[model samples]
Target: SMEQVAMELRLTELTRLLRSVLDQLQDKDPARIFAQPVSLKEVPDYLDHIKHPMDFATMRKRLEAQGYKNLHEFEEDFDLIIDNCMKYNARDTVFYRAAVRLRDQGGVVLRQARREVDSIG
Candidate 1:
């Protein structure tokens, strides 16, 4: 009865991980700059610039509907959301800097999640 067991993560649990990490990045960001998908209201050429566009609100809804199967796929979508900011704004701009910070914080929190997964024994 004292023996420990290893547990494999399911797609639904992986969705929870993505959702948790997404919340970390979303809450870390100050306001609605990354909150909504970039649109004509935000920029004239936003859509043309990014082939793959994702934003906090759009991404969050994705979990309720569907989810990425693996960590890299999930990470790709997460980074694309921040990556869009880097592409749209100058390196010295507020949007750009904030995105960088959020991306790095993603590095921190994602690792934290992986560590927890490993310890699930």
Candidate 2:
């Protein structure tokens, strides 16, 4: 469905934007005072702050190393999973669970990264 495709695209874009912010934060000089660690909630919460293309394909070169064959296989698997779930009246539970968990985990990771960076600064 176009809706699902749109969600996939949106996810990739957001992932890219967040990664850029993280990378920037990581590259900042440690000799300066900085604010508290960024949070995952802060990313979406401050969506207006993101002013970039957010093309994550370059940062995710590890995915490209897997080759298009594998990529196609993954797409096929996604399609199969979608089909099966639709037939059985099941939603994307696995993805939803992982997504929710990642959101929480990402918040923790971001907080920790900020703490470490602050200490070093």
Candidate 3:
């Protein structure tokens, strides 16, 4: 139930994040060329985050370190999904985990978008 809601939120956020990631990957901003050092590396890093099984506690800490204030509220819900996916040996684990990760740090994504939008304005 809650997982479904979280999943939906995460999906919405990831679609937006993916677009930003792609835009950055395309080398759109020369001034901020190094804004995301792992622009390319992020793909593999994300793949590894959920390729096998993810520890929700670790995920929460990771996202918290990046400054997601409310992650503690949803960590268990997300972990439950990961655990279920792991039990079934799901190949799309990365996709599922990616959404959570994206959602958790959506502020960063939004920050970048706002910066770009403001720059244009």
Estimate TM-scores for all models: 0.79, 0.27, 0.23
What digit string (tens of lDDT, one per residue) describes model 1 on residues 1-121?
A: 2232212245567677778777887777876678987777857776788888888888788776646656666678888888778987899988899888888877888787767655642
Q: Which candidate is the best by TM-score?
A: 1
Say which candidate scores most in lDDT. Answer: 1
Q: How far is candidate 3 from the true structure (C-alpha RMSD, Å)?
A: 15.4
CA error at residue 88 for candidate 2, angstroms? 20
* Clash pairs, model 3 backbone: none
RMSD of each: 5.0, 20.0, 15.4
Query: For candidate 1, which ten residues in a row score worst on lDDT?
Result: 1-10
Q: lDDT at 4 for candidate 1? A: 25
Task: Between candidates 1 and 3, name the one with more favorable lDDT.
Answer: 1
Which consecutive 10 residues in model 3 have the weakest lDDT in total? 29-38
TM-score of decoy 3: 0.23
Prediction-by-prediction clash tally: 0, 0, 0
**What order do candidates take by TM-score, descending?**
1, 2, 3
Full-model lDDT for every candidate = 0.75, 0.38, 0.42
